[PDB]
Please model this.
Amino acid sequence: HAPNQALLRILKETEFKKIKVLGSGAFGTVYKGLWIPEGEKVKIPVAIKELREATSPKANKEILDEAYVMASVDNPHVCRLLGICLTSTVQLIMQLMPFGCLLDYVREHKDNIGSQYLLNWCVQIAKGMNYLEDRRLVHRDLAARNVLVKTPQHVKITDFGRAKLLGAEEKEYHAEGGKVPIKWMALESILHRIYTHQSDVWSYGVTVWELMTFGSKPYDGIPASEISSILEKGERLPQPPICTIDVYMIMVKCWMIDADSRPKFRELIIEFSKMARDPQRYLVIQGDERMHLPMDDVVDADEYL
Ligand SMILES: CC(C)(O)CC(=O)NCCn1ccc2ncnc(Nc3ccc(Oc4cccc(C(F)(F)F)c4)c(Cl)c3)c21
Model:
């Protein structure tokens, strides 16, 4: 394994301005804002998380470990961390993704989402996931809520709170146990707390199904404790109405019990790209052809290098 020479940038608090609240979680408030590096005539749209003073040493430690992961990744389909700021409580500064999480976005805009967008997002997520595999990173929480929308044409994978870097000799990760997203997890993760890139593939399949059903909840009837035996009996999520068998067979392959029988991300890239070239052959959406979707020194983070 190579030396990780990623730079962690520590920002001065006067360098960035909070403009409005985007949301608030358990660990603090997230603000829309602008980052104005001193002496560079540039303004960068950012999201800024200000951790609560209530935050434990334990929580702080785990948040910084997540920032370490985010600072180590550099791909157009993985979230961009700009830096952190070491004030009274720690602040994390990331690229603004103005359209929010992809799960909300498909629920809220389902009447205007065509086959071209759906297939392109599958490609993009596969590209980010492939890159994470190249980095020997196992995500462990892939899901539509954990994909952000920069523009309708460009999504990025986020939330590395569960991510684990594999060791050089290491093949699988073994977790300790706790609050787990059971309905997105490979069977071997539920049963034996084993996680691989192939288990991320399973999660990818569920994420695709979320997208193809415009944000339905997987196994909506069923409680989490029942999931693993349902899977052991060979039952899977149903074929979404818009999906040709071509697309559904792909999701199904992602949910093979034998992890090595699942597709690789680089193959998912290939197969969804083929379909993105003729999208109406692969997803059947009523009115598809009808559909389309959307101070001075402003630059996107992607162009600030
Ligand atoms: C909580 C919540 C507010 O309920 C959910 C939520 O975070 N979503 C906010 C909504 N949101 C909308 C556009 C948008 N664009 C970009 N980043 C967003 N969110 C965002 C997320 C995490 C960020 O930072 C980190 C980095 C690592 C670890 C942690 C952790 F929470 F564990 F402490 C935070 C930042 Cl700076 C922003 C955005």
